[PDB]
């Protein structure tokens, strides 16, 4: 009886309001009994110089370690008094804290969040303990090869800019970070104009607004003096980085080009194009009948263990490309097939594959936002990136307007005859030279 | 406000098939078919049949070929998945609203009429070596499978994956027999989220009714207990000590769940100290090295296992296991505080409610209830039953644990782990 368009139109609308200190409160009512409430902050590693790099990760470690009013390990017990899940994360441009709980605990839960992002006590003994733990984590992070390769891709792609800096920061900085630096970081970056208070589940908007007025009115939002950290354009560089470790069994490679950015119309088209290329893992069940030519070829010929495509967005820049894990005797074949597929998209795209990619993007968009945590995350990121939450109807309208011509033009703009950035880790003796990779970015026939 | 959520329609056909639907108005639709075809229904002469059957969902069928199924599923952006526990198999299909009619055709063709051609089945054999290997990268899977082998004798002892010796020896006749014997109307349930009731009823009557002809019944779970120790020289020692607890859908099962949350079931806070977790605080008082411990619970239709799982370095394994056993003993003797029982009850209620918020979790819960009891219980009744548990029943559960034949499994550098008699 219903339809796709009618179902899209029936989703309830997000409601947004703004307090006097500059805080923004967004929420989305629903009939479920549970809820998720959190605070998103526009402060990551990109707003850090070389002197204080890794400060944000250090502060994020010390968040759930007591405050002025809940000293010691009391705060943790309070959360577990109500069976709620308290979680946080940090990235290169954003930070987030949030709580999953019941509807009934919405008053108490918010009262905890305001405690966390205002009154970080930062006990010195806790600072020393977390310093030791962070050093252990920095030592142990070398075991994950995917994350190493992504850090290398960032470091080489955005060399000489803040985007090269990793989230955790160098091991030398963490050994010298003092309580003065952490307090300065908190006093500079955690401010009401840069925070968003999102919620999603069973609740009503005015109750959340009243609770926010109670527990967040103390934040300063005047931007004291000219202490207004503003980003600047970041230079992209085509380059290669290769870490040779022949003892390892598998090689990890990641190749990328410069992307459009957060708020560009082109992004949707790119999300279609990547969906045409797809992804593959050795445990997939499709086999040789998979629609993607790259996946079918890799499955039949065993070119790689796995591959995937990514489009990572930042303010006015980003990475667009692929990452694969493969044997040390298959890198040339994988690079050849990947670049051939990119050139095929740039020069000649048909209606059927574009329709398949559009359907894939529709299904992924629908399925990703199903719950309470993903919706709250969507609100929090949208209010900082776009300044407003885009309904799903607008997403369908944007997706439905793509066709073969648009995909060809966008791909020719962003992929064809461009200098990429390449990162390789492991037994990578067979990885082609940079001149060969560069020459593979066009065709003589075209 | 949005329209009120309509009641979950429930039906049991005369042939024994169960059909359940919930007509929300989300953009997507999700349809699941649940069968009692777990690994426990394998005998000793056809082990690994269920594992191969799980990976054979994409093969040729009478309705359509492998190429057609794969290309048609991926053309409309749909997703086909198969899941299997020790007791049940679940075929799930997710897509958009206006694409169920196509995909409903594929799903039954995967289930009600496979072919299992010789060359196709033969080509799929090496996959069993890959997937199992991936599943064995995590030590927990190996330890839990060994624990099930040690605790039980016949039915629930069968692993989820094929034995290494039998890879490449599974023939189409075994698969045909397994499907013909276990995939029948009285052992099936059809759940839908995002489609109406008459559509599912028509589909089931047209197709799933002919599959009737109910076959085997299966064995009964025999509990014996024992030890399995596998040394492999890894950095950390994993161990698990359990005992017979209870059957699912019973009064004592709620008591064992409450006891699990009293003892501790992992952290609720990122990098938390587990301050409320009694077991972690009991162990950490003596042991001053990194470690980890949690309560383990697993209930089935006729038997269940309750106990605890530990991860600790080789020198300190005995200290950790002794401390955890002592803490459970002290709880058994009577030392239990009503505030802690209430906190555990709140943890249980919060976890159960938050588990079924997603479409996947809701479909899994509805299917499990449909197969087990043949009736849908709303969340409110479950909450009332959880609150109804008396604090003395938790003590009774601890007494049942402390005075029963233990079953232990372990892995790592087993130079200092104790045996059952030492504890």
């Amino acid at each position: 009886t219903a339809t796709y368009a009618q179902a899209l139109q029936s989703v309830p609308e997000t409601q947004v309001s703004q307090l006097d200190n500059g805080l923004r409160v967004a929420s989305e009512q629903s009939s479920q009994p549970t809820c998720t409430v959190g605070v998103w902050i526009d402060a990551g590693s990109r707003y850090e110089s070389e002197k204080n790099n890794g400060a944000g990760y250090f502060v994020e470690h010390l968040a759930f370690k007591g405050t002025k009013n809940r000293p010691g390990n009391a705060l943790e017990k309070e959360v577990e008094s109500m069976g709620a899940h308290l979680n946080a994360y940090s990235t290169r441009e954003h930070t987030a804290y949030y709580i999953k709980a019941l509807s009934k605990d919405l008053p108490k839960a918010v009262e905890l969040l305001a405690d966390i992002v205002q009154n970080c006590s930062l006990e010195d003994s806790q600072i020393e303990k977390e310093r030791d733990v962070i050093l252990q984590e920095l030592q142990e992070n070398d075991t994950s090869m995917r994350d190493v390769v992504f850090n290398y891709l960032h470091a080489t792609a955005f060399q000489g800019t803040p985007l090269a800096q990793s989230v955790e920061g160098p091991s030398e900085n963490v050994r010298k970070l003092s309580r003065a630096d952490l307090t300065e970081y908190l006093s500079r970056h955690y401010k009401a104009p840069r925070m968003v208070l999102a919620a999603a589940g069973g609740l009503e908007h005015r109750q959340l607004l009243d609770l926010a007025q109670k527990h967040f009115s103390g934040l300063s939002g005047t931007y004291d003096e000219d202490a207004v950290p503003t980003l600047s354009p970041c230079r992209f560089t085509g380059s290669q980085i290769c870490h040779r470790e022949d003892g390892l069994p598998l090689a990890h490679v990641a190749i990328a080009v410069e992307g459009p950015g957060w708020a560009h119309p082109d992004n949707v088209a790119l999300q279609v194009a990547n969906a045409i290329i797809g992804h593959y893992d050795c445990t997939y069940g499709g086999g040789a009948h998979l629609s993607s030519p790259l996946a079918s070829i890799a499955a039949t010929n065993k070119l790689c263990q796995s591959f995937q495509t990514f489009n990572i967005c930042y303010a006015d820049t980003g990475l667009l490309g692929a990452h694969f894990v493969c044997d040390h005797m298959s890198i040339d074949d994988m690079m050849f097939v990947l670049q051939g597929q990119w050139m095929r998209l740039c020069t000649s795209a048909t209606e059927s594959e574009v329709l398949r990619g559009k359907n894939l993007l529709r299904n992924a968009l629908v399925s990703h936002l199903d719950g309470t945590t993903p919706v709250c995350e969507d609100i929090g990121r949208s209010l900082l990136t776009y300044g407003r939450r885009i309904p799903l109807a607008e997403w369908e309208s944007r997706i439905a307007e793509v066709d073969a011509r648009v995909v060809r033009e966008v791909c020719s703009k962003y992929f064809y005859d461009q200098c990429p950035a390449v990162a390789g880790f492991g037994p990578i003796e067979q990885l082609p030279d940079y001149n060969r990779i560069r020459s593979g970015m066009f065709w003589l026939r075209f | 406000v949005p329209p009120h959520p309509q009641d979950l329609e429930f039906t049991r056909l005369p042939n024994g098939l169960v059909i359940a639907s919930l007509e929300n108005y989300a953009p997507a639709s999700r349809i699941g078919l649940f069968i009692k075809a777990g690994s426990r229904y394998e005998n000793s002469n056809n082990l690994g049949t269920s594992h191969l059957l799980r990976l054979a969902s994409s093969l040729t069928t009478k309705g359509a070929s492998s190429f057609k199924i794969t290309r048609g599923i991926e053309a409309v952006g749909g997703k086909l998945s198969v899941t299997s526990t020790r007791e049940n198999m679940a075929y799930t299909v997710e897509c958009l609203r206006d694409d169920v009619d196509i995909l409903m055709e594929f799903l039954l063709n995967v289930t009600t009429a496979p072919e299992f051609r010789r060359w196709e089945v033969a080509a799929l054999q090496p996959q069993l070596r890959i997937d199992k290997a991936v599943a064995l990268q995590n030590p927990q899977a190996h330890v839990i499978e060994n624990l099930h082998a040690a605790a039980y004798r016949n039915a629930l002892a069968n692993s989820l994956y094929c034995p290494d010796y039998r890879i490449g020896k599974v023939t189409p006749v075994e698969l045909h027999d397994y499907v013909q014997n276990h995939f029948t109307s009285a052992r099936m349930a059809l759940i839908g989220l995002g489609v109406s009731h008459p559509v599912l009823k028509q589909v089931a009557e047209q197709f799933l009714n002919i599959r009737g002809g109910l076959g085997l019944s299966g064995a009964k779970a025999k509990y014996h207990g024992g030890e399995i120790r596998e040394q492999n020289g890894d950095s950390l020692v994993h161990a698990a000590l359990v005992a017979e607890s209870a059957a699912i859908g019973s009064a004592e099962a709620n008591a064992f769940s409450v006891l699990q949350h009293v003892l501790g079931a992992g952290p609720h806070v990122k990098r938390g100290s587990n301050a409320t977790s009694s077991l972690y605080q009991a162990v950490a008082k003596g042991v001053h090295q990194p470690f980890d411990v949690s309560a383990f619970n697993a209930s089935y239709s006729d038997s269940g296992l309750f106990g605890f799982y530990t991860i600790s370095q080789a020198a300190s394994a005995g200290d950790v296991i002794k401390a955890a056993y002592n803490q459970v003993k002290t709880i058994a003797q009577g030392n239990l505080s009503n505030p802690d029982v209430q906190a555990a009850k709140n943890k249980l209620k919060a976890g159960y409610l938050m588990s079924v918020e997603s479409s996947e979790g809701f479909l899994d819960e509805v299917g499990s209830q449909a197969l087990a009891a043949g009736s849908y219980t709303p969340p409110s009744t479950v909450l009332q039953q959880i609150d109804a548990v008396a604090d003395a029943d938790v003590i009774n559960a601890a007494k049942k644990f402390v005075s029963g034949r233990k079953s232990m499994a372990a892995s790592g550098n087993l130079g200092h782990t104790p045996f059952i008699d030492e504890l």
């Binding site: 997939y284 | 997703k79 998945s81 079931a265």
Partner: peptide
């Protein structure tokens, strides 16, 4: 949170990595 606490489950998919 590395310790197992619930009975294991095996998942296999057409276009998703398998998990346990």
């Amino acid at each position: 949170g590395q310790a197992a606490g619930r009975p294991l489950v095996a998942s296999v998919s057409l276009n998703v990595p398998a998990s346990v």
